Amino acid sequence: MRECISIHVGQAGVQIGNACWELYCLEHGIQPDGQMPSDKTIGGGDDSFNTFFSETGAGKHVPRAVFVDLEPTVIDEVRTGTYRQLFHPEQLITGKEDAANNYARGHYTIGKEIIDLVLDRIRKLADQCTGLQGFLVFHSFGGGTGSGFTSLLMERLSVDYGKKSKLEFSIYPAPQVSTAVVEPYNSILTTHTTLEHSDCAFMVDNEAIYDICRRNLDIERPTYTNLNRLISQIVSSITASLRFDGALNVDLTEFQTNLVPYPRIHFPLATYAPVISAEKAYHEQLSVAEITNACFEPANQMVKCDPRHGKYMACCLLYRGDVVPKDVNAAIATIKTKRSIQFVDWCPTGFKVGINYQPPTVVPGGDLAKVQRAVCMLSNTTAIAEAWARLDHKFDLMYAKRAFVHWYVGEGMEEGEFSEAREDMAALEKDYEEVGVD
Amino acid sequence: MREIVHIQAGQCGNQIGAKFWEVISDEHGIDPTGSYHGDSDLQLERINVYYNEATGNKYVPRAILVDLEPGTMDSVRSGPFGQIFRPDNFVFGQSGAGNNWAKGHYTEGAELVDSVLDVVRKESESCDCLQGFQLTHSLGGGTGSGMGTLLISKIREEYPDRIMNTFSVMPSPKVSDTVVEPYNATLSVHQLVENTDETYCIDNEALYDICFRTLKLTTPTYGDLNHLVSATMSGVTTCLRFPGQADLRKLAVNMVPFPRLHFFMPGFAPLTSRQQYRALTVPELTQQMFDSKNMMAACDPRHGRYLTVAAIFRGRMSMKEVDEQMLNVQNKNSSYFVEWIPNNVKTAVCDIPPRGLKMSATFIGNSTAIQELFKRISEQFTAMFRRKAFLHWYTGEGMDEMEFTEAESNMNDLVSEYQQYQD
Amino acid sequence: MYTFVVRDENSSVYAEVSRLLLATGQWKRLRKDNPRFNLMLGERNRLPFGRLGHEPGLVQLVNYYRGADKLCRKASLVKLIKTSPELSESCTWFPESYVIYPTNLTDEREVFLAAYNRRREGREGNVWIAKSSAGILISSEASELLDFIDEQGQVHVIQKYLEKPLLLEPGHRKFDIRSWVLVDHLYNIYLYREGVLRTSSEPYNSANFQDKTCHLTNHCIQKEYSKNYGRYEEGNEMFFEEFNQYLMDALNTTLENSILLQIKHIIRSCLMCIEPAISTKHLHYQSFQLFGFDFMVDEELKVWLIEVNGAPACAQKLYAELCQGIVDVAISSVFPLAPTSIFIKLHH
Amino acid sequence: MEVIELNKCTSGQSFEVILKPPSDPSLEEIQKKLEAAEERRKYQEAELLKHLAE
Numbered sequence A: 001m002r003e004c005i006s007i008h009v010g011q012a013g014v015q016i017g018n019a020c021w022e023l024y025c026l027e028h029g030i031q032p033d034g035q036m037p038s039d040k041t042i043g044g045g046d047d048s049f050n051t052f053f054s055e056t057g058a059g060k061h062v063p064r065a066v067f068v069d070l071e072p073t074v075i076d077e078v079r080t081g082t083y084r085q086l087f088h089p090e091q092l093i094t095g096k097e098d099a100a101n102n103y104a105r106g107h108y109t110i111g112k113e114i115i116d117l118v119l120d121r122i123r124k125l126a127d128q129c130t131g132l133q134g135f136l137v138f139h140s141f142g143g144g145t146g147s148g149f150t151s152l153l154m155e156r157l158s159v160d161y162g163k164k165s166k167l168e169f170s171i172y173p174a175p176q177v178s179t180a181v182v183e184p185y186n187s188i189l190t191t192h193t194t195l196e197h198s199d200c201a202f203m204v205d206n207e208a209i210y211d212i213c214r215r216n217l218d219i220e221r222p223t224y225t226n227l228n229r230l231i232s233q234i235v236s237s238i239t240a241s242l243r244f245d246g247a248l249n250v251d252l253t254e255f256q257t258n259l260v261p262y263p264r265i266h267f268p269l270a271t272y273a274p275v276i277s278a279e280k281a282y283h284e285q286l287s288v289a290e291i292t293n294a295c296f297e298p299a300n301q302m303v304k305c306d307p308r309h310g311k312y313m314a315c316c317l318l319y320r321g322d323v324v325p326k327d328v329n330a331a332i333a334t335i336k337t338k339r340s341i342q343f344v345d346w347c348p349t350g351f352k353v354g355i356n357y358q359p360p361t362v363v364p365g366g367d368l369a370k371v372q373r374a375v376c377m378l379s380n381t382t383a384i385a386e387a388w389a390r391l392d393h394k395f396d397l398m399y400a401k402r403a404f405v406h407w408y409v410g411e412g413m414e415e416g417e418f419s420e421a422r423e424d425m426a427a428l429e430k431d432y433e434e435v436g437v438d
Numbered sequence B: 001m002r003e004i005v006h007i008q009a010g011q012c013g014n015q016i017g018a019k020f021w022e023v024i025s026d027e028h029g030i031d032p033t034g035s036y037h038g039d040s041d042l043q044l045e046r047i048n049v050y051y052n053e054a055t056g057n058k059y060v061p062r063a064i065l066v067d068l069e070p071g072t073m074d075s076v077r078s079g080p081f082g083q084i085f086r087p088d089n090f091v092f093g094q095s096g097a098g099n100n101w102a103k104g105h106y107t108e109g110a111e112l113v114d115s116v117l118d119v120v121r122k123e124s125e126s127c128d129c130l131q132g133f134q135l136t137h138s139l140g141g142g143t144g145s146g147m148g149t150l151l152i153s154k155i156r157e158e159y160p161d162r163i164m165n166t167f168s169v170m171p172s173p174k175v176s177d178t179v180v181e182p183y184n185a186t187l188s189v190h191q192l193v194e195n196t197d198e199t200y201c202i203d204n205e206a207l208y209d210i211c212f213r214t215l216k217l218t219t220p221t222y223g224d225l226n227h228l229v230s231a232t233m234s235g236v237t238t239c240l241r242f243p244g245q246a247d248l249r250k251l252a253v254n255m256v257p258f259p260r261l262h263f264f265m266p267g268f269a270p271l272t273s274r275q276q277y278r279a280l281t282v283p284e285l286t287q288q289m290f291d292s293k294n295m296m297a298a299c300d301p302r303h304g305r306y307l308t309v310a311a312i313f314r315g316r317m318s319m320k321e322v323d324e325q326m327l328n329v330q331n332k333n334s335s336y337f338v339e340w341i342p343n344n345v346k347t348a349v350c351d352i353p354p355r356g357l358k359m360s361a362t363f364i365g366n367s368t369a370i371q372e373l374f375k376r377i378s379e380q381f382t383a384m385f386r387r388k389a390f391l392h393w394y395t396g397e398g399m400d401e402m403e404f405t406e407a408e409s410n411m412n413d414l415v416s417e418y419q420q421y422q423d
Numbered sequence C: 001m002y003t004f005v006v007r008d009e010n011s012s013v014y015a016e017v018s019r020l021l022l023a024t025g026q027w028k029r030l031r032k033d034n035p036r037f038n039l040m041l042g043e044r045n046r047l048p049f050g051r052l053g054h055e056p057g058l059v060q061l062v063n064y065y066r067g068a069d070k071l072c073r074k075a076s077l078v079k080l081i082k083t084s085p086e087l088s089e090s091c092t093w094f095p096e097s098y099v100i101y102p103t104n105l106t107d108e109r110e111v112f113l114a115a116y117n118r119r120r121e122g123r124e125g126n127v128w129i130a131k132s133s134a135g136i137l138i139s140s141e142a143s144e145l146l147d148f149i150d151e152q153g154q155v156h157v158i159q160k161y162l163e164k165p166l167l168l169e170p171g172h173r174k175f176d177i178r179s180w181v182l183v184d185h186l187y188n189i190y191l192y193r194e195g196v197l198r199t200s201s202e203p204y205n206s207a208n209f210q211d212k213t214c215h216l217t218n219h220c221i222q223k224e225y226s227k228n229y230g231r232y233e234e235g236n237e238m239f240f241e242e243f244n245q246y247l248m249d250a251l252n253t254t255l256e257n258s259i260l261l262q263i264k265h266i267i268r269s270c271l272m273c274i275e276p277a278i279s280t281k282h283l284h285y286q287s288f289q290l291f292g293f294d295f296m297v298d299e300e301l302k303v304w305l306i307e308v309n310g311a312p313a314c315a316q317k318l319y320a321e322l323c324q325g326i327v328d329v330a331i332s333s334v335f336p337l338a339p340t341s342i343f344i345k346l347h348h
Numbered sequence D: 001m002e003v004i005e006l007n008k009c010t011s012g013q014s015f016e017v018i019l020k021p022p023s024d025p026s027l028e029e030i031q032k033k034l035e036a037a038e039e040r041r042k043y044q045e046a047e048l049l050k051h052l053a054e
Ligand SMILES: Nc1nc2c(ncn2[C@@H]2O[C@H](COP(=O)(O)OP(=O)(O)OP(=O)(O)O)[C@@H](O)[C@H]2O)c(=O)[nH]1
Pocket: A009, A010, A011, A012, A013, A015, A016, A070, A098, A099, A100, A101, A102, A140, A141, A142, A143, A144, A145, A146, A147, A171, A172, A173, A174, A177, A178, A179, A180, A183, A206, A224, A227, A228, A231
């Protein structure tokens, strides 16, 4: 067993973390007070779930997580919520005034004064690890803390834990659930200084989750609770291989090996199904084929883009529930004859499959219905570069007028960091087109 | 725990400031004696943004009342909520400013500013994390205009990293009959341009036309003008006073793309005088809120372009239909929004409506059409200054003419600056 | 009030559609760099599809299908037909073609040479034609076709030159047929009832392929290098009503039976083949596109597909009607306004 | 259409199907970036206080 530490940064990073760990306890049968009656190795153990939970002599199962926010309102909730007892106070870190949606303020100004403290709280969790694998960092692109302090942490972690993998879960900004105008700036600033430090990052476009909630869950005005409950399901599907007995994606290193052939092209697309509303009278359960085919509908992807016009470098099917390999291959063969799935020449045309018999766990009182089988497809498509195109375009429109730039210069950032970061994104978009186009 | 220190200076500053505390006090369930008697926890969740908590569960506004003459402030202390303000926080002189910016900024005001700053320092020293300050004042008189800007320049020296936000009443020949007004306004605009982060332009010209044309008030009074300022001030601060998504610096980061262009056009719907029975539909809130007749800057937005816009809807209403109507105004008049600032229109919804309204809407616009406001003042200013008329009132207090030329140039540059982004 | 932008000032087709839309008082035009648009008349090259469909509350439509180049490229069309079981390498309406890359650079050189020697050995007509999307050569010697391609630096397609084309009389002259096909967002395949014949005003001469004027029916080669331009018909353009009467008086048949059936079959087969790849049925934005199909008719009244144009222009006499039809079924059908259709739906 | 590396266990199984074959800054350098940005803010605030002093 090898532990994984999660780091939740900013509002979106912390509220999503609160949704994942809620689900982790339900899937592993851990109670809100940290008790896990199923673990017969009281006081410890080297089981698969221990990769995410430490154990105390009292039998409490404590998440291996650190919550970081430059403002206390969002983490105070976790200090008085249902699972308040899961975390000890040292695990929750809060400042007093936030980054004001200003990347520079989060990276330079406020980040400088709190960087060495977060790293010291992390060291306290790593000391409890007999064999640390790496980190999963949750954050948003848009916020001043999620973008600005995260990149600062990623640079520091690479220095203090060189041989350790670092996966990201990043929230791509969507105007429909955002009131900040400068998020394109922040999104690009953080991707520039974090890119060399991230080994694999799963982007989630809030626009994608927002429509899945309105379309599949019949939620007129989706709240952050609606969004984070769904996002945690996808996260749970992606992290299941590290928390359960199995052979696919057993450790963080296996993600970059199976999904990232090129270091810079490390942004896999995620597709999840089925998403069924609990308010339905009663749904006709979908078959292995029906849900496998759904992984190629753009309406189920965590980012809207057309993989028919990109090329695949890797494809990974993660099933949960009543699923046997025979039906998987049957659905796959049917989809190849009907779908346009183009792999890059220097890659094999194949799929890695993972099957976990326990079907997806639903949160009581949530919006998702209990289903007999679900799947999450992880595909490294060059089609995800469409997200960088949109992001870079909005950046260019504003930067041509230097709109809002003075807010960043005022925090100590040089204007050159803008164009420096933008040139990098230009190189990223070129790297994608080199791979997926002829 | 993001506290705001409120300052109101001068006749207009205190009369409008007093109404503000009266209005929001009613929304947060605080009575004239500071005791809480509300029924919604949502009233107290962000109450400490503008109020302090005293023994016995008393809520005392975090407000400093400043004037150079006791006249107006005795009115406040004898007003409805007069007994709610902190007694010490009353700082006043005995000479007045005689509608003379110089007297407020250099002579009569300097004799008093240090004591006003001892109260500011006292109030800030009790804040866990101070957002910044907000000032209510007029620009046409002597105290709010002259001493108000002196307070800003000194506060900014003592709290250089805190946000400065002002509600500033622009003078109109339709409300005031004092000839020196353009002089006092031009001098003040020079200061605001340099030393404030956000300034709401409350044009008495617009307030007058609304009361006379729309509301049909034949003989508008300041009570009628300040009814519209109350509703607007309540509207623009809703994001700060109730649990929403909120921060003075965050508002600024999204409203102000260029440091000098921090003058907002406020708007409100429905415009009402002191007989609202019929429910106002969401489409009605949106049309009025964006129509010029509901603007409070006396600038036809169709003459300029919106750099950023922010809308606040209050009450229990279809949040889905709000998006529809809002996106309909943009996609039906996107020629009035700059295209080089994506998604520059943002909207929030609050569930607690103002008193006596099923639902209202507040409009916060950073429009380049605000230049018409500054052009108006500049025309009036230069008409007198080219003849050096009425300068002796000012040169007698130690000012030179060059100081007028500089304030004139700073404002005409501001107009030129607004005009370039409009193309 | 709908909105639209214009990003191809060179499109004579959508210049009229843009002029018509504005004439409805219900369509407002915005700057080309303006994102809040309902309809995009996009550029030809590098149209930014990745940016479409991400404006909250705006249903956006574009006049191009992403991936349609696979059908409108000389080399792409050849590859699509051979590698697609729907069409199959045995497709009987497409001239035997080969994708040849210049030797300064998969490639079908050795494969193209195999069938060539087969004909030369079988006393069969071995007159090919070399061309590219970017200069056309008609020769019955293979060495001339390959050397010509090597002298160029781009891909070339060599296909069998129809040595027995249907010659109109009088004139003993070649011709081709342009059919304008419109595909709406729902993927209905509509065929404009009106087509044109781009005839060669020069008598076809099977003993001189150097004089490519009686062989290449291009309106630009006829109005330039041809000296009988406009003699038999106006602008070397013959419409269906006349071409139909000719077949009745000369061959005792009609255009619908002898030619149009095959044409409507070729169109369906092509667009139906690439439908899984380009359909916008479940996409966050919608697409339509006007296509220009070019056919050859041989003496046996068999129809062949020459190429498929992605940004086709229209005959002068048919601009008004067709452009109006684009607004009825392709634009207004998605943004309705406050017949006897001119199209023929090819049900599938 | 070939399956390979079938792994079975109590909680599930995994396998691979192949359809077709193919064809940092130091701790010191970060401290300087942070302190350089801090100095620029000090210079900017100094010039502001100089302005206010005049
Ligand atoms: N999916 C999801 N997105 C969120 C959530 N909270 C915020 N966001 C998105 O994150 C972006 C804003 O960034 P925040 O995370 O709120 O900012 P921050 O990291 O707290 O940093 P500050 O600037 O100091 O507030 C917006 O685009 C929001 O849509 C959340 O709970 N779930």
